[PDB]
Amino acid sequence: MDLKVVVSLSSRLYTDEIAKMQQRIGCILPLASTHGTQNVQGLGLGQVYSLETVPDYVSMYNYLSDCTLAVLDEVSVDSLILTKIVPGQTYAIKNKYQPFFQWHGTGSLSVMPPVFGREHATVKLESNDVDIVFPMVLPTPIAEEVLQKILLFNVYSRVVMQAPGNADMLDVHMHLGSVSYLGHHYELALPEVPGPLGLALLDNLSLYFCIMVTLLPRASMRLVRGLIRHEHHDLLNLFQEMVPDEIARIDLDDLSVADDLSRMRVMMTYLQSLASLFNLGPRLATAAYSQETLTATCW
Amino acid sequence: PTIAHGDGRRPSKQRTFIVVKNCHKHHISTEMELSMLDLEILHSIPETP
Amino acid sequence: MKVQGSVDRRRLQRRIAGLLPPPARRLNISRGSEFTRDVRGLVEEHAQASSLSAAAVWRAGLLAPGEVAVAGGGSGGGSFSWSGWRPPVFGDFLIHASSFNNAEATGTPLFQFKQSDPFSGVDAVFTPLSLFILMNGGLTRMANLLYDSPATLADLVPDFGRLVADRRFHNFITPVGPLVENIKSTYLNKITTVVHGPVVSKAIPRSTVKVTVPQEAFVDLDAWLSLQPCPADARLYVALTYEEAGPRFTFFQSSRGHCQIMNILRIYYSPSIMHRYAVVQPLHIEELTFGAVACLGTFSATDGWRRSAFNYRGSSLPVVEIDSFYSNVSDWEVIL
Amino acid sequence: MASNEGVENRPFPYLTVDADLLSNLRQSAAEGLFHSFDLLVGKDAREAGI
Amino acid sequence: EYRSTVNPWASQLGSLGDIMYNSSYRQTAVPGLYSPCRAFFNKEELLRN
């Protein structure tokens, strides 16, 4: 019925940081406890993302899905007033995140750690000896695009250990390093060392791959074989005239419908559960957005 | 104030200090749970002893 | 003068006057007063029952357009946005009276097996102990007291040999929710559960309902795992696991999150996956699946799931009980 | 948990006494100073049915 | 006055003890545990005063 938290600062803040914090009014940041009054230490994302420890980017995701999000409402010299986000309510939220992505009306938003930069997110409170780190929110189509970019880097950076190859570490940085958008290219900050909990997520992904590879429908494989030669298509333009040798070696036996049918039945059940692995974070639903007002009505 | 000295010492003229102090804010809260059954039978009119 | 437009002032003000006032919160407090007519109204919550009189029904407010009763009739009416209290959605099942033991805990979660005969009129519904005897100290001594002649349960599920072999037994079982009401009849019982709603007792003198799971099966996933946040909600899950010994049923509690929980359950079942995959069954087409998981509802963290006994037939069974449950069923996700 | 087989929660008319029973109470029940105790918190701290 | 240090292996900036207990290089460390030598080797903690 009443959804409000009063975060109290121990020490007055300086006239420059009260001005910086006010630019973030209407932004989400996750607090630790669901209580009416709190300290500043639970406020930001700052403890998981510190300067002294490497950013994992997957322990940070796990911190968001556990916390309780809140919308910053009012800023003063000694306080920060928020309203918590609970399941069965609607909220009015502004688009004020610094690497600027533009939202659509009637779209779904996603919450992810500050992938684009540590400096874009933080408002440093040197008066209270804390750094308040805001999470970055994106439209769902582009948020998944960034999450995939980060995971494949954890593999390929490790696969290419120290290679003098001009091809390596220049292709994996030009492909995975950036995310393009409407008339822009946004660089991602990618970890120098792929840490744990990011590889442990890719271990689970592989287990699904070890299963699916045994039940692939062969009728599917014979179709792509006929199309890469006979017809010309934009989807199959990825494959050149050359055909993957694995398919010719995997698919030898003649097609039987009764087998490819039950192969599809077993496989489809894994994709349904595979989807749970990819969300990895809280999602919002937006019903109205004004290009000029910069205010959505999220649910 | 100051003292008058005979030597060539550089005289410190009139001096004043202006100092400012500011307010601090404190908040306090507690939580108490209640049963819907009691909150409801608060409303009803009892028919039997 | 001209009649003001089509719209009529002083007539919309009356109509909007009803819509304006929101419900009451944040009342000011005085230790001198310490209990007021103001504090009362803020606290009273307008129970939804009556004594069956045309005048008494108007008193309680059952005949009100909103989905929940607003007391006083029209007085205090038109708020319609107050703590979003959603009433429970009950389900009614017709059961073979010999299939269901009448001595059930009134809160036990139920499961319906989807029959495969068209245009039937009776249903098959199982408790955690019925499912134990069907799937074949502890539950073994207690479930056999409640259910003897396990054949009558085997008659409901005629494919159980086939279903657990192809590992598609779980998708014909749909969770329904805790017991709320049970009429005890000679031939065809009538059972009432609560699906997707605050599990609340419909008896006339109200009593708190708490869902009960046998302690043998209930596994706290959060303590076994043991800065991290402390959220409001915690969730209850079921896992149907096809092992070498046979199918198995377990209940779980944690407040991590879905993507995490699906990872913790794979770590938790790693010893038992290796064993089945090496001893008896390396590989086949359909037999690949291991198990499934569903979510049974959300209850308050920091509390709930006390432990208690279930006394019947001069023997007890240690059982856990969850408070303030909110039933909310999702589909099965394959773990492997 | 752990009524310890001794307590009935029926609503009695209790008698107020001036003595101080609060002193060091929590850590007394936690370690079995007295058996057959009950500990009710929040919603549970209410009169029982009749 | 007569000596520069007692052990360079800890006094000097890039030295072993500085490497072990100063925050600049312990990125990999688990944040839970408590280090007594942190108050003596951390740079920000020294310059705060």
Side-chain angles (χ1 to χ4, degrees):
Chain A
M1 162 69 62
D2 177 21
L3 301 171
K4 182 198 172 189
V5 179
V6 183
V7 164
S8 183
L9 303 148
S10 57
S11 61
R12 256 184 155 217
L13 62 80
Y14 303 149
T15 73
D16 194 13
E17 32 200 35
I18 294 169
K20 285 181 189 299
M21 285 299 298
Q22 268 181 0
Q23 311 173 2
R24 302 280 197 176
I25 284 193
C27 288
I28 294 187
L29 62 80
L31 62 80
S33 307
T34 87
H35 290 318
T37 50
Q38 306 191 239
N39 283 139
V40 315
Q41 330 203 6
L43 178 51
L45 211 64
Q47 51 168 329
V48 56
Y49 198 178
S50 53
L51 283 167
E52 50 177 7
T53 56
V54 65
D56 194 9
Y57 280 170
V58 190
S59 78
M60 309 186 55
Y61 263 108
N62 303 324
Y63 185 85
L64 290 146
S65 50
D66 304 3
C67 264
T68 59
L69 295 174
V71 193
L72 191 60
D73 259 358
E74 174 186 356
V75 180
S76 166
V77 303
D78 298 348
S79 303
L80 299 170
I81 291 181
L82 309 88
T83 59
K84 39 201 198 76
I85 294 181
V86 310
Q89 304 276 356
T90 318
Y91 297 92
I93 176 195
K94 281 185 160 282
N95 176 22
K96 286 180 161 188
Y97 312 88
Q98 256 217 23
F100 190 96
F101 297 82
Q102 198 155 169
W103 303 348
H104 314 282
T106 73
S108 60
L109 298 173
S110 161
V111 188
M112 37 161 34
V115 168
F116 290 95
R118 171 80 201 267
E119 287 204 350
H120 295 258
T122 67
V123 178
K124 290 218 170 184
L125 266 52
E126 285 158 343
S127 182
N128 287 251
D129 211 7
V130 296
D131 320 335
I132 292 188
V133 188
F134 285 71
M136 162 65 49
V137 329
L138 284 191
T140 320
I142 190 162
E144 309 169 333
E145 150 76 51
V146 178
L147 211 171
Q148 161 184 137
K149 287 273 186 48
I150 294 170
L151 289 187
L152 297 189
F153 189 85
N154 282 6
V155 176
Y156 272 75
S157 98
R158 141 182 288 272
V159 151
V160 181
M161 287 291 302
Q162 323 90 12
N166 184 257
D168 314 10
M169 292 177 72
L170 293 199
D171 155 68
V172 307
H173 278 266
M174 287 306 287
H175 273 184
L176 306 190
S178 156
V179 172
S180 64
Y181 203 43
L182 304 174
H184 295 288
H185 290 269
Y186 302 86
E187 289 181 340
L188 311 172
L190 302 101
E192 175 205 39
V193 280
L197 292 77
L199 309 167
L201 174 62
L202 285 154
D203 288 8
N204 292 5
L205 177 63
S206 59
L207 302 189
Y208 285 100
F209 286 177
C210 293
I211 297 285
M212 291 179 176
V213 296
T214 78
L215 37 80
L216 289 190
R218 312 295 184 75
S220 173
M221 288 178 166
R222 194 164 299 187
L223 177 63
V224 182
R225 289 168 42 94
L227 293 176
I228 55 101
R229 301 217 65 85
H230 298 330
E231 270 90 332
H232 300 75
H233 203 252
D234 303 17
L235 294 184
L236 307 155
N237 192 31
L238 162 61
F239 315 96
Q240 312 290 335
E241 295 85 357
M242 172 264 189
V243 63
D245 302 9
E246 312 97 40
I247 300 161
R249 289 167 31 241
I250 296 296
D251 170 65
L252 297 173
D253 304 328
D254 51 313
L255 307 183
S256 68
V257 186
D259 300 336
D260 286 358
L261 181 50
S262 64
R263 280 173 184 148
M264 178 79 60
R265 174 197 198 91
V266 180
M267 181 172 192
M268 179 192 175
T269 67
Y270 281 91
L271 282 82
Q272 296 192 0
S273 62
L274 177 63
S276 71
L277 238 66
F278 286 134
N279 59 14
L280 177 63
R283 288 171 159 181
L284 310 166
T286 294
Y289 182 70
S290 299
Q291 198 151 179
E292 38 171 0
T293 320
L294 301 144
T295 289
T297 294
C298 183
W299 164 72
Chain B
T2 55
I3 305 183
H5 295 284
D7 289 345
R9 295 202 151 162
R10 189 153 301 175
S12 187
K13 299 91 54 178
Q14 311 105 41
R15 297 166 293 165
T16 71
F17 294 80
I18 308 177
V19 185
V20 178
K21 295 301 198 58
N22 308 101
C23 295
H24 296 300
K25 302 272 280 287
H26 309 287
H27 299 290
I28 61 171
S29 67
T30 299
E31 278 191 14
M32 55 222 184
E33 207 163 27
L34 286 166
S35 297
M36 205 91 83
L37 323 183
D38 291 330
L39 308 193
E40 279 168 319
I41 70 182
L42 255 179
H43 197 58
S44 74
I45 301 176
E47 293 177 22
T48 180
Chain C
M1 298 299 310
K2 314 123 300 296
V3 284
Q4 313 172 343
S6 44
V7 193
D8 186 12
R9 196 171 310 275
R10 319 220 83 181
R11 183 259 180 198
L12 274 300
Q13 303 185 14
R14 294 180 217 150
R15 290 217 42 169
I16 200 177
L19 301 150
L20 283 180
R25 4 160 269 188
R26 198 170 304 98
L27 275 66
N28 270 42
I29 61 171
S30 312
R31 192 174 213 270
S33 57
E34 148 86 52
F35 208 62
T36 69
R37 181 173 60 256
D38 308 10
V39 173
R40 266 224 176 196
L42 181 157
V43 162
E44 297 176 10
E45 195 61 320
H46 300 195
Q48 27 202 9
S50 100
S51 180
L52 185 47
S53 300
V57 169
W58 275 110
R59 182 79 191 182
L62 299 180
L63 296 172
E67 281 194 345
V68 196
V70 281
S75 67
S79 69
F80 281 145
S81 60
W82 43 284
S83 65
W85 170 257
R86 169 199 172 82
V89 191
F90 297 114
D92 285 295
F93 295 82
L94 202 66
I95 295 308
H96 280 284
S98 72
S99 173
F100 196 89
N101 191 316
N102 287 332
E104 290 303 336
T106 308
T108 54
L110 255 41
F111 301 86
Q112 177 190 32
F113 181 80
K114 242 56 185 166
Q115 300 284 25
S116 293
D117 40 54
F119 308 120
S120 170
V122 304
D123 304 327
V125 175
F126 300 107
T127 47
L129 299 99
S130 300
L131 226 54
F132 193 102
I133 299 305
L134 181 269
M135 296 186 312
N136 213 341
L139 312 185
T140 299
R141 301 184 308 179
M142 188 66 179
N144 281 135
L145 298 194
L146 292 167
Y147 306 93
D148 56 327
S149 191
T152 59
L153 309 182
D155 279 319
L156 289 164
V157 197
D159 297 319
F160 183 81
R162 168 52 87 100
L163 292 166
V164 308
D166 294 7
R167 268 102 198 187
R168 306 192 326 277
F169 179 57
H170 59 256
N171 51 24
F172 286 95
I173 283 194
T174 80
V176 177
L179 263 158
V180 150
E181 193 181 68
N182 175 20
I183 316 172
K184 294 142 179 181
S185 316
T186 301
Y187 279 105
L188 291 170
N189 273 342
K190 184 62 168 37
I191 299 180
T192 298
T193 78
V194 42
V195 351
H196 186 279
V199 46
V200 140
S201 158
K202 58 168 49 186
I204 309 101
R206 295 241 306 185
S207 179
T208 297
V209 165
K210 46 203 63 171
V211 308
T212 75
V213 193
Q215 187 183 113
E216 319 280 339
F218 182 89
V219 168
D220 188 327
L221 198 59
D222 200 308
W224 169 86
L225 194 56
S226 172
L227 193 61
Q228 69 287 341
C230 44
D233 281 357
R235 280 154 296 261
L236 190 72
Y237 294 85
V238 175
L240 202 158
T241 294
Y242 303 101
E243 294 160 5
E244 160 195 15
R248 199 167 178 168
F249 222 75
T250 50
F251 293 75
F252 295 100
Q253 164 240 335
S254 69
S255 55
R256 300 288 170 179
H258 195 215
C259 185
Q260 298 196 60
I261 277 156
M262 284 297 157
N263 295 15
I264 317 305
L265 288 186
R266 260 189 294 273
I267 80 182
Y268 176 77
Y269 279 117
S270 281
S272 65
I273 287 176
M274 290 277 305
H275 195 258
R276 159 173 162 274
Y277 239 78
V279 172
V280 168
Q281 284 176 332
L283 188 147
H284 211 81
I285 319 182
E286 332 287 350
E287 309 171 353
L288 220 49
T289 311
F290 183 74
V293 181
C295 171
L296 288 189
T298 90
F299 67 105
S300 68
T302 69
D303 255 4
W305 91 272
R306 308 174 68 177
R307 300 165 196 172
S308 54
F310 172 69
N311 287 323
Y312 161 81
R313 193 64 203 283
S315 69
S316 79
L317 181 68
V319 133
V320 296
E321 63 185 342
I322 300 176
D323 265 308
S324 296
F325 201 71
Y326 183 95
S327 168
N328 211 359
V329 170
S330 72
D331 48 4
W332 303 85
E333 301 104 357
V334 179
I335 53 182
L336 183 50
Chain D
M1 302 178 69
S3 292
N4 292 138
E5 205 212 352
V7 40
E8 40 175 20
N9 193 18
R10 290 174 171 87
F12 291 118
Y14 283 81
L15 282 82
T16 310
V17 305
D18 207 352
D20 177 293
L21 301 181
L22 301 140
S23 192
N24 208 318
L25 180 57
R26 194 249 299 282
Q27 299 125 351
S28 295
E31 310 190 89
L33 159 50
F34 59 88
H35 69 105
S36 80
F37 81 107
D38 203 349
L39 185 268
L40 311 183
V41 175
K43 166 185 52 186
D44 322 317
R46 49 156 294 196
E47 266 56 37
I50 306 182
Chain E
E1 316 182 33
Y2 50 99
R3 66 167 78 115
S4 190
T5 52
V6 148
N7 48 341
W9 300 341
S11 313
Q12 288 165 313
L13 193 39
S15 49
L16 167 56
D18 185 294
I19 263 47
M20 291 162 49
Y21 305 107
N22 202 311
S23 64
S24 174
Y25 286 100
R26 26 201 300 152
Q27 224 68 15
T28 321
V30 156
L33 295 174
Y34 168 89
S35 294
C37 294
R38 153 126 172 170
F40 302 101
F41 283 83
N42 206 273
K43 195 167 185 166
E44 153 197 25
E45 297 213 25
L46 299 192
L47 297 178
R48 156 156 293 273
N49 299 303

